[PDB]
From a paper:
The ribosome is the major protein-synthesizing machine in the cell that converts the genetic information present within the codons of the mRNA into an amino-acid sequence within the polypeptide chain1. In B. subtilis, the MifM leader peptide is located upstream of the yidC2 (yqjG) gene, which cannot be translated independently of MifM because the ribosome-binding site of yidC2 is sequestered within a stem-loop structure in the mRNA. Ribosome stalling during translation of MifM leads to unwinding of the stem-loop structure and maintains the ribosome-binding site accessible for ribosome binding and induction of YidC2 expression. The B. subtilis MifM leader peptide is 95 amino-acids long and comprises a C-terminal region (residues 69–89) that is critical for ribosome stalling as well as an N-terminal transmembrane (TM) segment that targets the MifM peptide for membrane insertion, presumably via SpoIIIJ.
We present a cryoelectron microscopy (cryo-EM) reconstruction of the MifM-SRC at 3.5–3.9 Å resolution, which was used to build the first molecular model of a Gram-positive 70S ribosome. Homogeneity of the MifM-SRC was increased by replacing Ala90 of MifM with a UAA stop codon, which arrests ribosomes at the first stall site, and thereby prevents further translation and subsequent arrest at downstream stall sites. The MifM-SRC has an average resolution of 3.9 Å, with local resolution calculations indicating that the resolution of the core of the 50S subunit reaches 3.5 Å. Only one tRNA is present in the MifM-SRC, located at the P-site, where it makes codon–anticodon interactions with P-site codon of the mRNA. The CCA-end of the P-tRNA adopts its canonical position at the PTC of the ribosome, with clear density for the MifM nascent polypeptide chain extending from the ribose of A76 and traversing the entire length of the ribosomal exit tunnel. In addition to the PTC (discussed later), four main interactions are observed between MifM and the ribosome: Two contacts are observed at the constriction, which sandwich the MifM nascent chain between Arg66 of L4 on one side of the tunnel and A751 (E. coli numbering is used throughout the text) of the 23S rRNA on the other. Two contacts are observed within the lower region of the tunnel, one between Phe85 of L22 and Ile74 of MifM and another between A1321 in H50 of the 23S rRNA in the vicinity of His68 of MifM. M90 of L22 does not directly contact MifM but rather forms a Met–Sulfur aromatic interaction with G748 of the 23S rRNA, suggesting that the influence of this residue on MifM stalling may be indirect. In the MifM-SRC, the side chain of E87 overlaps in position with the induced conformation of U2506, suggesting that the MifM nascent chain prevents A-tRNA accommodation by sterically preventing PTC nucleotides U2506, and thereby also U2585, from adopting their induced conformational states.
Author numbering:
A (entry chain BD): 2 to 276
B (entry chain BW): 1 to 93
C (entry chain AZ): 66 to 89
D (entry chain B6): 1 to 44
Amino acid sequence: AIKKYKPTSNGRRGMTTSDFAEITTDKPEKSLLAPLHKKGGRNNQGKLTVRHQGGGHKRQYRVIDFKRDKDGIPGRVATVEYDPNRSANIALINYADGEKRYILAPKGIQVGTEIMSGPEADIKVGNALPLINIPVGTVVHNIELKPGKGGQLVRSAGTSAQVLGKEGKYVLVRLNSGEVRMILSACRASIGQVGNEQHELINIGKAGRSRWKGIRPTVRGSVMNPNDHPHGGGEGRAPIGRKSPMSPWGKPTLGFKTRKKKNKSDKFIVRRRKN
Amino acid sequence: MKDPRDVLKRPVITERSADLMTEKKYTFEVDVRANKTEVKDAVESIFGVKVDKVNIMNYKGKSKRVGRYTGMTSRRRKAIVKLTADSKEIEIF
Amino acid sequence: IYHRITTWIRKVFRMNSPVNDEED
Amino acid sequence: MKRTFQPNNRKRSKVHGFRSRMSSKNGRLVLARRRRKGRKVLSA
RNA sequence: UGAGUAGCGAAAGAGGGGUGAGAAUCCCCUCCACCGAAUGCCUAAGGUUUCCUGAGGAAGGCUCGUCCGCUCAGGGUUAGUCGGGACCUAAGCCGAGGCCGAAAGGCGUAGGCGAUGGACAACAGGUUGAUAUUCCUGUACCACCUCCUCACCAUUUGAGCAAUGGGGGGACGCAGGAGGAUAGGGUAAGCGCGGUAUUGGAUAUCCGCGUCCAAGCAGUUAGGCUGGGAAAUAGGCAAAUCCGUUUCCCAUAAGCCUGAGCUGUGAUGGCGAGCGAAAUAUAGUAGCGAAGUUCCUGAUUCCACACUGCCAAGAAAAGCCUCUAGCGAGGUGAGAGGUGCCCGUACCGCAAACCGACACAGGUAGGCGAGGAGAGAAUCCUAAGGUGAUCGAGAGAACUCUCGUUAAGGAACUCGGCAAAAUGACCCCGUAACUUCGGGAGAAGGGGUGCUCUGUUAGGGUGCAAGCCCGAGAGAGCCGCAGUGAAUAGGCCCAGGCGACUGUUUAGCAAAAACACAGGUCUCUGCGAAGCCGUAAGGCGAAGUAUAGGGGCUGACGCCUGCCCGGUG
């Protein structure tokens, strides 16, 4: 849910926050906590490769085995916890081994529900089983690109994916925004789209909340001096007279493909740019 | 080397030190690299007196210009050994 | 008593506002 | 008002120390220029 | 030369004596003045003796000078417990082999370095011309070691030590609100003082003082454990009677861990108002020494990020608590005996001992920071503690500056109500257009607050009472021009352009109609990324994953955002 704030002040006029209803416990387990030094977007050389990063609130990583390498062992969802690091909520799950591992949380999961990581596991949400056993068209999340590497795909909240069908090599998958790839059939994946779909609807409502993110402000390019930016110079709000809108780096950004025309992944691209 | 006897330099003759003579303690200059543990073995050998609580102090040198030519004083390091009760002094003698 | 004495002088600088206006 | 000279011995030592120059060949060149001229006080 | 002209560096001094060739400026005494949420102290940074005593004084003192942070002679910082190192770790850095690079070198494991953090045992008075949670007089505490003294045990059926290993714990955000107690202030009691000649007080008079720690011991404010016992264990690289997990038993508290600060012990000790010698090298100490209670008031401190709430969910490791692996022939449990090192300790640190060429109206963490009024670290006046802030004398011109005043008028001044004036303190009455319904709104516009009595009020705080306090409401009265009388604590009503706002910007001419922001939109990016920093390796993005990131454009919100792909991409 979304709790709208009354406009007691100018920053209250638009700001909104998620219900946090999924959250159960105020604190993370100590055993899986990890440090997160903030690079600030700087290179190891010390130069800032990425613009407007850092200055945000301190964060502490929770260990999360997306790989789910263990199998045949039933688990249980004890608690759910907020994750500063990403839009997706974290749900702690207690294994029958007594092992504990934070895991990505699809919506509609209930506390105490059983979850098997094995191939023989049921389709029921929260389970993760290999693509060969997956029925066509079922929603899937946290898909790995290769086995044992972890599921880079579909980690953010509210994202989803669907299977168009499968061969022995490779299983088809609908990636978000309609793109398709022949992901390896042996590769593991987890059924059920990620929760916290309401995160997109959240409104920041003030400059101050952005500082906590912390999203540093970005100067408009025309305002910038001509030496610093291609669109700079002029006598007040200079027209984008220069041919082809441009990044401060020389490559054009509006409609210009940044793809390498030759790539190993090009064979896997059955479909591209549905818009 | 090493020997206790060479550790000492000269006694510190000051009005502040003469008052300490009734305190059963006697100041002596000591090598800068010497430790308190070494000084305790020196009095027990040279004087033969039992040793209690030894204190040691270092001093940065003061400037002592001679005409155009300024020059830092050498860094003295006196030590204060509080001798045990009932023990004859060998100082001045 | 040696009574040695030494004197030191330095040029320094500088300002240049220069506060000059016109003709324009 | 605040001025450029705000002394800190740890900074003067870490930055302008003899080993700060020993750390790199260029600093060794600085020491070499320091010694060829016969300076009484090398480094800082 | 300008010149004996500018300046003499914010902001109280006066007198008496003393020293001396020389005294406004030095010293002492008596008044007076200024700071006192400091111009007070304590300690970093940094300075590196500038501290102290005895002398000198030509130069350095915006002036003389017997005086100096000056110039000369000696003298002065004392630590197992304070800070740091013989403990740890963060950012970051170095970095065996190694990954790369014409060379030089770059990158980065293992490992190490590195506090601004975590761990850690000593507190009260005294002492010098100084340095004192270091020296001293008391009481202590931690760690380690047995020529020792007792007590308990066990000889691989093994008394115990128990890891570089596994867990536990350490271990952490912001805001707010009750509570307990205390560092501190004041009242009644108590003890030492003085009867004051300026009218009047042995009197509800006056002045001054009103106590004391770490600890070894007992319990208490109260919080936290969510429960403890038994059995079973695909796990926590091997193992585990440890943890985690599972299943039952008992759950309204037996039990588990931590507490500020209190009562007696620490103390038949010393602080203490005041007396104040011999005299010594006549400073002024030695030395003597009373009461030492009670109530009110109490935090910004502590219990403690304990509790509640919230989002932006908020370090790392060791010291510790346990577990086994593993070591074993003498060990444990308490007393005595000893050991405990290396550096920093002076002074200046709101400043004449530093940043500033100066003995410069500026700049410099943090920790203590009182009283009367007051909401208050506002303001004014005063304690504790300092400061007489180092060129002056006297005339009382213009003129310049800092201010106070102003007859009749008012913004007729001026580019412009610039500057100045006025309003402003609490309680009460009352309050419009407009609006996103929050605002606007201290709207505007008015009234009352000084003193006395009925009134140790009505009502509350604490207390057995006694008492101390917080205190309206009113009535009657008294006065003055005056009444938050001093001092500081908004001037408003409108009408339009631009910009949502807070915020940011040219330090040192321009702070804004500029920038930014949330939002809106386009485009690109499928992870070995698009974009990058780099010859590369590596790394950022990212311990991310199209509801996520990069770039362009537009700027909250409301109504909207039309047509054109010929040309240029």
